[PDB]
Design a protein around this ligand. Sequence first.
Ligand SMILES: CC(C)(C)c1ccc(CNc2nc3n(n2)C(=O)CC(CN2CCCCC2)=N3)cc1
Ligand SMILES: CC(C)(C)c1ccc(CNc2nc3n(n2)C(=O)CC(CN2CCCCC2)=N3)cc1
Lengths: 324, 314
Amino acid sequence: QEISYNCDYGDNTFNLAIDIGGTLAKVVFSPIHSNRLMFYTIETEKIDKFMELLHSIIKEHNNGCYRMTHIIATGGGAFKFYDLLYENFPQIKGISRFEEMEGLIHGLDFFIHEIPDEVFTYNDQDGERIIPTKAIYPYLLVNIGSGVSILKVTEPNNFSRVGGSSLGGGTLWGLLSLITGAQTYDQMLDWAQEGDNSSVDMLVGDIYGTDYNKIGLKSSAIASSFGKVFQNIEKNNGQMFKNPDICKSLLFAISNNIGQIAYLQAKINNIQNIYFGGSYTRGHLTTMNTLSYAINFWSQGSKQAFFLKHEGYLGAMGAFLSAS
Amino acid sequence: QEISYNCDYGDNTFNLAIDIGGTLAKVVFSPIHSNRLMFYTIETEKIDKFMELLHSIIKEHNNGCYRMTHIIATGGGAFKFYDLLYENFPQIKGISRFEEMEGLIHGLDFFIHEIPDEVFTYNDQDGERIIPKAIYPYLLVNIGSGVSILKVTEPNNFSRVGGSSLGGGTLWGLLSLITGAQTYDQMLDWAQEGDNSSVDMLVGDIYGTDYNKIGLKSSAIASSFGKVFQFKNPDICKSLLFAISNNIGQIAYLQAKINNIQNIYFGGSYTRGHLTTMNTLSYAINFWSQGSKQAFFLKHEGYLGAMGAFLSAS
Ligand SMILES: CC(C)(C)c1ccc(CNc2nc3n(n2)C(=O)CC(CN2CCCCC2)=N3)cc1
Ligand SMILES: CC(C)(C)c1ccc(CNc2nc3n(n2)C(=O)CC(CN2CCCCC2)=N3)cc1
């Protein structure tokens, strides 16, 4: 989903920014003179195919001219696959690394300051609102991939990772894949969307028979994700539970958890604006709503969720920008 | 698991404190003049048996005298099963209600101040240590089905500052449906035997090395179940126990940090003298605070609310 941006092409270098995660490898590049930023994603585990795509991009978008190509790598793979990369691209101007947290922040900051129609709020009440993007700072980034990293940015170039969590997209995809046997992330999202978590979850209402306003929770609030199930090829003979219900429950469970940790991190760091990055939302309305509600709920309106059109490309984008 | 205590039998009343939670129904009482505190737990699912037990207790330890029995009920069951309670005890001295967070805190604070050998620390390196102002402020992480978190800054100054739906229920639920484990006990056996890297993506899997710039070694868990969408039940168990326990750990740390708290007491039905769990929770606290915060555990971790209700009669 290309972006129009006036790039500086003064050094006549074709910059291939790659971000090789645990699961997803992202590429950001701009054919010289195009004023277009282009983005692809392929699985990390298809490492061969990832390299074919890289050669293919040089072939088609830079006239097969290796000598003018600079590879800039970020994410774990910048170390882990560096040798393989150096070996597979003998003729390039060079392959260099850019630090992962710097990349994320550099990419996000760029989108926040330079790309119209990139940053948006979303809940079910309000719909989608595009932001017309130094009341920027400080801001939080919650980067949801397989796992979750949380970074603060106090000002341009001043950032740090303040924490993270092992309960991310990878937990969601993994649990629901094994349990319900969904084959796509899309399919589990559709299953979630039409499901009912109250079949598998304990609500406050189940415990109290009513609201619990003294602690600020309604009957419908979730007390225990999957709380009803102990209290009741393999799992198919295990299952007495609706797959869509399971998918809903676990999507709420993980999102709400991310929401809470984001909130707590924002709290500590006196941040109002929370940006969600990574591969997790994917413009999925329910997901964005759950995240926005969690932030709103915990902050009582005082803090705000934000999403990004190019949410999965923060790292690769930052890497790209470093090669200036 | 009786505590011996010098109670005030000033009212001459048999005070029967109950805390009916979502899964667990708890009871604390003292036979008059015994100076004994007694504790039983029955599943909420078996509410009828819990009711039968309350009758039993009155018959056995208060001499069949309903007239001098005062029930103090807390937990959501005090609301949801009010009708059953009144139906069971129309003729007792009173059925009082005590608010649940106040009961938790009153229970905890009494155990911290008054009962020797109740509060301990535990990890794999140092073993169990019994602890014998410097008390406040403190945190309570109450884990049953879900999680409540409370801050207590002075004797009668506390609040629930947040909570989590990812509790023991999430663990028992996923592990029971995925693996087939019968009991919380047999999850810990499976987990004891387990290697989580089978299903968890580690830092070392992503970087081929440490990421010490962010303070994470190659063996740190980047994504629980992160290998699963590209399986040994022991591995699953250990993965999810880490997943849930570390999360609770992190959230406890963050809440403690927001509130400038050093000491974090765990209550509920989750630790239950399970060494691994207690180690996991301690380590998370340790890790996130670089050793400057501390997990504490309680011999009667499950009875905080009943205990606080019991004390409200006093
Ligand atoms: C892909 C990449 C970047 C390697 C990665 C790694 C891990 C995760 C998510 N997992 C995670 N993140 C954490 N985790 N676990 C902890 O256990 C503690 C923690 C903070 N801790 C650091 C040391 C000082 C004390 C505070 N941050 C996401 C992405
Ligand atoms: C049994 C009993 C006591 C009924 C119970 C209920 C819920 C849970 C766990 N679930 C949970 N706890 C939360 N949750 N979710 C939230 O979503 C938000 C939240 C705090 N929020 C409320 C409004 C002001 C800002 C802070 N506390 C455990 C035990």
